[PDB]
Amino acid sequence: QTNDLKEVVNKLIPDSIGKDIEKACQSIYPLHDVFVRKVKMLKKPKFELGKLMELHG
Amino acid sequence: AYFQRPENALKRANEFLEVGKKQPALDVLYDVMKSKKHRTWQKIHEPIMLKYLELCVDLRKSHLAKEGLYQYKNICQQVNIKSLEDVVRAYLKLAEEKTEAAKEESQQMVLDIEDLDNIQTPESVLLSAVSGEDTQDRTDRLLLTPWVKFLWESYRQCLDLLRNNSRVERLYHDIAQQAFKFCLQYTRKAEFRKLCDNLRMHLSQIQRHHNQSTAINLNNPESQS
Amino acid sequence: EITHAVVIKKLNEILQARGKKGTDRAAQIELLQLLVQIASENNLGEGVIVKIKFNIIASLYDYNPNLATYMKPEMWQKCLDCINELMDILFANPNIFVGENILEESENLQNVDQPLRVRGCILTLVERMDEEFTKIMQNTDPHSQEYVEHLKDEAQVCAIIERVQRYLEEKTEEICRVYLRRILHTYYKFDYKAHQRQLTPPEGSSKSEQDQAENEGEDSAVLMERLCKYIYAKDRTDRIRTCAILCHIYHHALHSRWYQARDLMLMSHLQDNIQHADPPVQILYNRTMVQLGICAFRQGLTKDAHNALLDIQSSGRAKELLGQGLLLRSLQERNQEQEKVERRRQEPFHLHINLELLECVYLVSAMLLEIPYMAAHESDARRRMISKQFHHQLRVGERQPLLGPPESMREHVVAASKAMKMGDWKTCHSFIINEKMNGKVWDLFPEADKVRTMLVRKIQEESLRTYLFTYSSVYDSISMETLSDMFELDLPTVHSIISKMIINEELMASLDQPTQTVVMHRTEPTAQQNLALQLAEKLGSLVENNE
RNA sequence: AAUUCUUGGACCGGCGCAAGACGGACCAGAGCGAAAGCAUUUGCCAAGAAUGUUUUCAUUAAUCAAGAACGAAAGUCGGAGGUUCGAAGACGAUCAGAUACCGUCGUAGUUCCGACCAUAAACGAUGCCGACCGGCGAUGCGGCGGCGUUAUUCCCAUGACCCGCCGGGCAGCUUCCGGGAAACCAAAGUCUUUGGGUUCCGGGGGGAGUAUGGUUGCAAAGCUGAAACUUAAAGGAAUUGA
């Protein structure tokens, strides 16, 4: 929620989210195979050009 | 089984630093150093270990710099310890260069507002002015002392466990000299241990010799120089 | 919103999950807060809020599950605000707000037992607060900047304990509790606090009615301890006349008279009486008894101070004044100690008192046994600096001193061979910041006591030491050499005639004294009699043995 | 193989859109429920066993003709809906014949709301309440005690493991408890040494759950239920052959 898509995909390339949940749920019941199984894109913004042309270096 | 092609270890460690998560970035590299991939110093092991000890310094963990160097030297035997020597020298240079920057900033920027601060005593220090002294010491402790108790440990570290007797090592007496030169820049109680460690490891030296230990004798370098 | 027919009946449905397991502990103060920020009508948001708030702060303290752990700074400041508002709306509302008939509502709830034990549910809030504040202090690194950031609330606390004190609708009888509280904050407030409310001398400077508002505080121990003592000779408990008097004794020290506070400490007779109280009383007794010896020294009473500060330093377990000392023997009880431990800024410095034993003995050793140390041994005192003197000349490479003991002994030995400035100007180099000179709340008055006590015990060096082949003696120049008041160094040489009985002849109309001291080698065949004494002593003991 | 679909571009591949069903793998001789039965998330509503108890009432209890609540699937009437599958039926094959098995279609139905019907190998083919009589290892829930491991790094303290004990539950293994025609059953045992309490119900096989009367239902049908006549066996467990 707190940051933009470029930084969210940068998190998905490792599994930084999957590590964080595996650390938080140690006290409740220790997990091992914690992955972000899937991501679906539901609604996208108004297609500008400068956004993608700076996402492409 | 975490890694096929141990070059990938660095790719994930760098990829975790794209997020800014240094703990899981370290976790990867430590998990890689300690497994089947003990093939005598692959050219990849230099940047693996160098990034590993960079992260270990930034997180301020002595025990993990101990472990990394202890795994590296085991796999990096006399076949080539040229890289171990450059690894330990780099690790020590990172530690002492960050402490220089830590003194500089916590002894200027925060001590320059401390020159402007309420030195015209408030009651809060008039209670504390029966045990302690100057506010420069009361602040620099908070931001500089955490790094010098890491430096000292990092000098005891590389001298204590990595270099006992060890025939192959001039770098021992290099670190020793550079840590004696460290003493008269900063705190002084990390020198009583310095002298007594040099002595205790001399008592470890002159008794048995059942390794590739120093033949303390006519051999001018290892004994005299 | 409805005439406390919904408010007192929700207050109870939200103050029922207090301390139950699945309450969450956190989203409770919220529901207790949404009964003064949602309540906004007369005695419905304004008047009965005494009760809603009593249960708002009580639950706020209970954000901590443990009672051996410290509160956090956010809820801590929240408490210090939450407590203040109650006091300010209680002052200008002259009524008893858990009962006691006033009009009809919304007070007068005498249906529940009696408005005293929950009318005195106001000080047990601020008393629990004072016991809370100590946890914040005990659980911080003392050398850190967070410690002084935390001590900035010491001022905030002492304003609220003053406000609850001004609230004298008591029924001294039972406000004694917050008198003990108030004096337990002020009893160790130092000279700069005590003196500098009158020591700007009373003229057109500081005796006006609007400035003489903080000079009440030094003569407050006398105002309040008098009551808390002489009412509890009648009243039941032990702690609120014994903590009170030891606060009075400790406060009448460190600025005022040795004679004033010895009468109080003898009056109590705790020397042999305090045996069977609790250690949290036996600790501040030790703090007081150490402050006795320091005050006696600082005054210049340099053997009655030594005769007092023996068994504390004699034992290595002198850490009854500080944090916990040595390792093992009962982890189970060592856990109990680290919440007994006294707060940091209250602790008296320990290389300050090590430099009070090993200087009171320096003035009752480097003088006393120099008269029987002409090979004339039979006055031997084997508990002194010698505990140090044995060991820090028992080594070979000795240069400029660094510690307290060497930086004391290294000019002790050259105070022995009088050298009147070599003995002095090694006690006033870097000691001042090493907590000898500055650390006492007097800058140049402890040294003015000390160096005078040196300048007198450095004419009493010619007495026992340099009198060998002296047949004529000088007196005008001897006081001019040691830059002292001539009479002040005449009266101890006078003492040495009636006390030490030196083999010398006084004729002080001329201000000279011929000595005629010739025992030079008459004393050595009686160095052979020192033992023919032991011969003669025991042949007055062999038949005691035998018959 | 054929009936079917397809150069008015089927099948295969991509991006979307709608629809109505259904909750895989995790899923177990695991759990809950009076039985039928019950599985994506989250919220709301009332219920419930077991455990814990130095709380409370003081025999208020067990089983039950009459009477009553729920009752899979199919099925009937009314409204909404119709993706899949599919009694009827339309064919295509195989076959001596196929009115079936196999294959392409396919109405009722399958799904939801509201009225009915009240039956299943509705099974543990085994009524309920209570007491007594071997051992072992696990398991699900609650409690209790104890080296040690791991997270909260500060570990008080909770969670994940480990070792035992207690009580309720689903089951398992084992034995000359004992029983039984045996298969087998710690209950199907404590039965000629026959008696703890109580409800329902069986009397050789057919005829027959048929006829008839009554009653319930719109219908289908449900509950109660004989006789004449025929017959020497029908049947249960286990053995040896084919």
From Swiss-Prot, chain A:
Instruction: Output the Gene Ontology terms for molecular function.
Output: structural constituent of ribosome
- List the subcellular locations: Cytoplasm; Nucleus; Nucleus, Nucleolus
Question: Which keywords accompany this UniProt record?
Answer: Acetylation, ADP-ribosylation, Cytoplasm, Differentiation, Isopeptide bond, Nucleus, Phosphoprotein, Ribonucleoprotein, Ribosomal protein, Ubl conjugation
For the keyword Transmembrane, the answer is no
Gene Ontology annotations for the cellular component aspect, listed alphabetically: cytosolic small ribosomal subunit; nucleolus
Q: Does the keyword Phosphoprotein apply?
A: yes
Primary localization: cytoplasm
In the record, biological process GO terms are: cell differentiation; translation
Q: What is this protein's function?
A: Component of the small ribosomal subunit. The ribosome is a large ribonucleoprotein complex responsible for the synthesis of proteins in the cell. Part of the small subunit (SSU) processome, first precursor of the small eukaryotic ribosomal subunit. During the assembly of the SSU processome in the nucleolus, many ribosome biogenesis factors, an RNA chaperone and ribosomal proteins associate with the nascent pre-rRNA and work in concert to generate RNA folding, modifications, rearrangements and cleavage as well as targeted degradation of pre-ribosomal RNA by the RNA exosome.
Assembly, in brief, is: Component of the small ribosomal subunit. Mature ribosomes consist of a small (40S) and a large (60S) subunit. The 40S subunit contains about 33 different proteins and 1 molecule of RNA (18S). The 60S subunit contains about 49 different proteins and 3 molecules of RNA (28S, 5.8S and 5S). Identified in a IGF2BP1-dependent mRNP granule complex containing untranslated mRNAs. Binds with high affinity to IPO4. Interacts with DDIT3. Part of the small subunit (SSU) processome, composed of more than 70 proteins and the RNA chaperone small nucleolar RNA (snoRNA) U3.
**Family according to the record:** Belongs to the eukaryotic ribosomal protein eS1 family.
Protein's UniProt name: Small ribosomal subunit protein eS1
Lineage of producing organism? Eukaryota, Metazoa, Chordata, Craniata, Vertebrata
This chain is encoded by the gene named: RPS3A
